Write an enzyme that holds these catalytic residues in place. Sequence first.
Site, PDB file in Angstrom:
ATOM      1  N   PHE A  24       0.851  -1.177   0.000  1.00 60.78           N
ATOM      2  CA  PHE A  24       0.000   0.000   0.000  1.00 60.78           C
ATOM      3  C   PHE A  24       0.888   1.227   0.000  1.00 60.78           C
ATOM      4  O   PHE A  24       1.797   1.347   0.823  1.00 60.78           O
ATOM      5  CB  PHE A  24      -0.946  -0.003   1.205  1.00 60.78           C
ATOM      6  N   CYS A  30      -5.679  15.126   0.418  1.00 61.59           N
ATOM      7  CA  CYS A  30      -6.898  14.834  -0.331  1.00 61.59           C
ATOM      8  C   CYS A  30      -7.549  16.129  -0.818  1.00 61.59           C
ATOM      9  O   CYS A  30      -7.330  17.185  -0.228  1.00 61.59           O
ATOM     10  CB  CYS A  30      -7.882  14.046   0.532  1.00 61.59           C
ATOM     11  N   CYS A  45     -16.131  15.519   1.749  1.00 60.12           N
ATOM     12  CA  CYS A  45     -16.165  14.147   2.263  1.00 60.12           C
ATOM     13  C   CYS A  45     -15.936  14.191   3.768  1.00 60.12           C
ATOM     14  O   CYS A  45     -14.874  14.619   4.221  1.00 60.12           O
ATOM     15  CB  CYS A  45     -15.099  13.275   1.577  1.00 60.12           C
ATOM     16  N   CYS A  48     -14.349  10.095   6.442  1.00 59.58           N
ATOM     17  CA  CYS A  48     -13.063   9.421   6.263  1.00 59.58           C
ATOM     18  C   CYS A  48     -12.526   8.735   7.527  1.00 59.58           C
ATOM     19  O   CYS A  48     -12.569   9.317   8.618  1.00 59.58           O
ATOM     20  CB  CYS A  48     -12.047  10.438   5.757  1.00 59.58           C
ATOM     21  N   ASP A  49     -12.027   7.502   7.374  1.00 55.25           N
ATOM     22  CA  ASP A  49     -11.481   6.740   8.503  1.00 55.25           C
ATOM     23  C   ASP A  49      -9.950   6.705   8.514  1.00 55.25           C
ATOM     24  O   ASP A  49      -9.349   5.867   9.191  1.00 55.25           O
ATOM     25  CB  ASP A  49     -12.018   5.297   8.494  1.00 55.25           C
ATOM     26  N   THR A  50      -9.327   7.606   7.767  1.00 55.55           N
ATOM     27  CA  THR A  50      -7.904   7.491   7.469  1.00 55.55           C
ATOM     28  C   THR A  50      -7.120   8.746   7.824  1.00 55.55           C
ATOM     29  O   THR A  50      -7.595   9.868   7.625  1.00 55.55           O
ATOM     30  CB  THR A  50      -7.692   7.159   5.964  1.00 55.55           C
ATOM     31  N   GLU A 115      -7.146   3.415  -5.518  1.00 54.66           N
ATOM     32  CA  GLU A 115      -8.345   3.721  -4.755  1.00 54.66           C
ATOM     33  C   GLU A 115      -8.595   5.212  -4.917  1.00 54.66           C
ATOM     34  O   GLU A 115      -7.822   6.025  -4.418  1.00 54.66           O
ATOM     35  CB  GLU A 115      -8.179   3.367  -3.275  1.00 54.66           C
ATOM     36  N   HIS A 203      -9.784  -6.149   6.876  1.00 55.86           N
ATOM     37  CA  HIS A 203      -8.591  -5.887   7.674  1.00 55.86           C
ATOM     38  C   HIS A 203      -8.930  -5.413   9.092  1.00 55.86           C
ATOM     39  O   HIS A 203      -8.160  -5.644  10.028  1.00 55.86           O
ATOM     40  CB  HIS A 203      -7.688  -4.859   6.973  1.00 55.86           C
TER      41      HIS A 203
HETATM   42  C1  LIG Z   1      -9.455   6.654   2.586  1.00 50.53           C
HETATM   43  S1  LIG Z   1     -10.033   6.372   0.960  1.00 50.53           S
HETATM   44  C2  LIG Z   1      -8.598   6.839   0.021  1.00 50.53           C
HETATM   45  C3  LIG Z   1      -8.844   6.850  -1.524  1.00 50.53           C
HETATM   46  C4  LIG Z   1      -9.792   7.986  -2.001  1.00 50.53           C
HETATM   47  N1  LIG Z   1      -9.707   9.200  -1.154  1.00 50.53           N
HETATM   48  C5  LIG Z   1     -11.239   7.404  -1.957  1.00 50.53           C
HETATM   49  O1  LIG Z   1     -12.041   8.020  -1.221  1.00 50.53           O
HETATM   50  O2  LIG Z   1     -11.499   6.387  -2.636  1.00 50.53           O
HETATM   51  C6  LIG Z   1      -9.956   4.547   0.883  1.00 50.53           C
HETATM   52  C7  LIG Z   1     -11.316   3.775   0.800  1.00 50.53           C
HETATM   53  O3  LIG Z   1     -11.936   3.633   2.103  1.00 50.53           O
HETATM   54  C8  LIG Z   1     -13.263   4.116   2.046  1.00 50.53           C
HETATM   55  N2  LIG Z   1     -13.634   4.648   3.357  1.00 50.53           N
HETATM   56  C9  LIG Z   1     -13.237   5.845   3.894  1.00 50.53           C
HETATM   57  N3  LIG Z   1     -13.787   6.119   5.052  1.00 50.53           N
HETATM   58  C10 LIG Z   1     -14.597   5.020   5.301  1.00 50.53           C
HETATM   59  C11 LIG Z   1     -15.450   4.694   6.377  1.00 50.53           C
HETATM   60  N4  LIG Z   1     -15.642   5.482   7.441  1.00 50.53           N
HETATM   61  N5  LIG Z   1     -16.102   3.509   6.323  1.00 50.53           N
HETATM   62  C12 LIG Z   1     -15.906   2.714   5.263  1.00 50.53           C
HETATM   63  N6  LIG Z   1     -15.134   2.920   4.190  1.00 50.53           N
HETATM   64  C13 LIG Z   1     -14.505   4.101   4.269  1.00 50.53           C
HETATM   65  C14 LIG Z   1     -13.255   5.163   0.935  1.00 50.53           C
HETATM   66  O4  LIG Z   1     -14.555   5.426   0.419  1.00 50.53           O
HETATM   67  C15 LIG Z   1     -12.358   4.462  -0.087  1.00 50.53           C
HETATM   68  O5  LIG Z   1     -13.101   3.497  -0.822  1.00 50.53           O
HETATM   69  N1  LIG Z   2      -5.421  -3.700   4.540  1.00 49.50           N
HETATM   70  C1  LIG Z   2      -5.986  -2.547   4.170  1.00 49.50           C
HETATM   71  N2  LIG Z   2      -6.677  -2.483   3.034  1.00 49.50           N
HETATM   72  C2  LIG Z   2      -7.282  -1.295   2.793  1.00 49.50           C
HETATM   73  C3  LIG Z   2      -7.221  -0.194   3.655  1.00 49.50           C
HETATM   74  C4  LIG Z   2      -6.437  -0.246   4.843  1.00 49.50           C
HETATM   75  O1  LIG Z   2      -6.246   0.661   5.656  1.00 49.50           O
HETATM   76  N3  LIG Z   2      -5.852  -1.487   5.025  1.00 49.50           N
HETATM   77  N4  LIG Z   2      -8.041   0.935   3.449  1.00 49.50           N
HETATM   78  C5  LIG Z   2      -8.313   1.298   2.064  1.00 49.50           C
HETATM   79  C6  LIG Z   2      -7.312   2.364   1.601  1.00 49.50           C
HETATM   80  O2  LIG Z   2      -6.852   3.132   2.472  1.00 49.50           O
HETATM   81  O3  LIG Z   2      -7.035   2.397   0.382  1.00 49.50           O
HETATM   82  C7  LIG Z   2      -8.429   0.082   1.089  1.00 49.50           C
HETATM   83  N5  LIG Z   2      -7.991  -1.221   1.583  1.00 49.50           N
HETATM   84  S1  SF4 Z   3     -12.337   8.857   2.025  1.00 47.87           S
HETATM   85 FE1  SF4 Z   3     -10.670  10.150   2.916  1.00 47.87          FE
HETATM   86  S2  SF4 Z   3      -9.088  10.196   1.307  1.00 47.87           S
HETATM   87 FE2  SF4 Z   3     -11.002   9.436   0.266  1.00 47.87          FE
HETATM   88  S3  SF4 Z   3     -11.999  11.372  -0.521  1.00 47.87           S
HETATM   89 FE3  SF4 Z   3     -12.865  11.050   1.545  1.00 47.87          FE
HETATM   90  S4  SF4 Z   3     -11.529  12.285   2.914  1.00 47.87           S
HETATM   91 FE4  SF4 Z   3     -10.412  12.046   0.965  1.00 47.87          FE
HETATM   92 MG   LIG Z   4      -7.696   3.202   5.299  1.00 47.59          MG
END
Ligand SMILES: C[S@@+](CC[C@H](N)C(=O)[O-])C[C@H]1O[C@@H](n2cnc3c(N)ncnc32)[C@H](O)[C@@H]1O
Ligand SMILES: Nc1nc2c(c(=O)[nH]1)N[C@@H](C(=O)O)CN2
Ligand code: SF4
Ligand SMILES: [Mg+2]
Lengths: 209, 209
Positions: A24, A30, A45, A48-50, A115, A203
């Site tokens: 990864f 973003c 958005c 987001c969990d990231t 992604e 995961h």
């Molecule tokens: C953090 S995003 C990064 C790539 C790009 N910003 C996007 O939104 O596709 C990675 C994936 O996790 C999904 N994701 C983000 N927050 C989430 C949440 N709270 N629950 C489930 N999926 C989530 C996003 O929709 C995306 O498919």
């Molecule tokens: N193992 C793993 N797979 C993923 C995620 C992540 O955080 N871990 N989150 C998503 C991402 O951040 O792209 C997609 N798939």
């Molecule tokens: S899920 Fe996170 S990285 Fe993807 S568009 Fe939304 S805020 Fe940006």
């Molecule tokens: Mg993630």
Amino acid sequence: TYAVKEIFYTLQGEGANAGRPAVFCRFAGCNLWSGREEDRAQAVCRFCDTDFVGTDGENGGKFKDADALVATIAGLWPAGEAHRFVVCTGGEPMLQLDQPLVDALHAAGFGIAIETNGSLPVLESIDWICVSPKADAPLVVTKGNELKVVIPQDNQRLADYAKLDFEYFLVQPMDGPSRDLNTKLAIDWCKRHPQWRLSMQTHKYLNIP
Amino acid sequence: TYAVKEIFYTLQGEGANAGRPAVFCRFAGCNLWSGREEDRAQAVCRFCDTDFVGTDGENGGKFKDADALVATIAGLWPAGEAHRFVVCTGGEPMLQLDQPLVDALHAAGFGIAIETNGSLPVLESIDWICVSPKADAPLVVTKGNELKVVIPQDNQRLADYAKLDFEYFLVQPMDGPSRDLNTKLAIDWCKRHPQWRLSMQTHKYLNIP
Ligand SMILES: C[S@@+](CC[C@H](N)C(=O)[O-])C[C@H]1O[C@@H](n2cnc3c(N)ncnc32)[C@H](O)[C@@H]1O
Ligand SMILES: Nc1nc2c(c(=O)[nH]1)N[C@@H](C(=O)O)CN2
Ligand code: SF4
Ligand SMILES: [Mg+2]
Ligand SMILES: C[S@@+](CC[C@H](N)C(=O)[O-])C[C@H]1O[C@@H](n2cnc3c(N)ncnc32)[C@H](O)[C@@H]1O
Ligand SMILES: Nc1nc2c(c(=O)[nH]1)N[C@@H](C(=O)O)CN2
Ligand code: SF4
Ligand SMILES: [Mg+2]
Ligand code: NA
């Protein structure tokens, strides 16, 4: 120059490639959220969990060119093993992913997945395109390999997504305080509309990166 | 004439089709275990997590012909929806699944998957062939769509399996008292030999049939 939050080797947790070993590469930044908690409530958005802010994660940093980034990516792959696979994510990877990086990754034997939130045009030499539409953002990528929709979102026209040009149509439960709720919603949706398949965040159940 | 334990509509929990809506048709009986608990410790396959004895489950019964069985399977599919998909399992489905059943399912708009232990010839007209080899049984099916290997089993030659003619190679951790241990084993295996991918029993994490 590439600004990367973290690079790590694990199993792809989501989508049609779930379970597959992958490096990864999480780009920093973003276009739909600043990544600051004070800004979340006002963001395009908001769920987001990231953490994609900065360049301080594992193997994170600013990379002077493509070869440097590819060397770090390739270095994480088990020695002597093929089936190289990299997931470009973030953050929104299309802010930074370019043809020179794609070409160098391919030259090093990597298949490439992305992604992307679908608000920016993608490079079509990418091998696996996963688009995850945000209901309040524009969607300019209307074709790819999988369309992975996080549900529920307000303002969503969920059934209409099926008219787009993708191989797979997936719903993924929104993680947060209502995850089990949303998982029940997502299962029921697929069973009522079996064009759609369930994508879990495996995961998080496996408790792996 | 077909002896069926149960027929039910859910999401495929395992393999490359995990997450996909499907009618499960679980045939009664297996050639590697009687299904009796007093026989388990002496059986060829001893780790089975399934009840396949008799015809007393949901929609279970003795079906006089293929049309009767197909009618019940079809009746579980959401009205007016396409993408019809049936998973023939058991039990060992290749004890009973024959060409007229396959032809009738195809005529009714169904794509057909099978879950088979690989000890018996399979019908090539089946659309999706999943083989799960048991270490102490013959393996006569050496080509298919996915080879889904439950690990760990004693006497297992895991790397050899990757020489066979399948599109996907998966390891699935053995459920039982050591499921979490086995899951870590399976993850590590894939990361070391990335030709392999992980198959979770997601229906057990989602708590769905
Ligand atoms: C953090 S995003 C990064 C790539 C790009 N910003 C996007 O939104 O596709 C990675 C994936 O996790 C999904 N994701 C983000 N927050 C989430 C949440 N709270 N629950 C489930 N999926 C989530 C996003 O929709 C995306 O498919
Ligand atoms: N193992 C793993 N797979 C993923 C995620 C992540 O955080 N871990 N989150 C998503 C991402 O951040 O792209 C997609 N798939
Ligand atoms: S899920 Fe996170 S990285 Fe993807 S568009 Fe939304 S805020 Fe940006
Ligand atoms: Mg993630
Ligand atoms: C019950 S079998 C029926 C189909 C066929 N008899 C076979 O063995 O493939 C269904 C699937 O679940 C797998 N399975 C059975 N018991 C399991 C267990 N304890 N843990 C993990 N997978 C298991 C089997 O290997 C097979 O892939
Ligand atoms: N939802 C669901 N999916 C499954 C199983 C099962 O019992 N439920 N077990 C396997 C089977 O019995 O064939 C295959 N995948
Ligand atoms: S071969 Fe399949 S159905 Fe038979 S006992 Fe083993 S896992 Fe169960
Ligand atoms: Mg089962
Ligand atoms: Na909604």
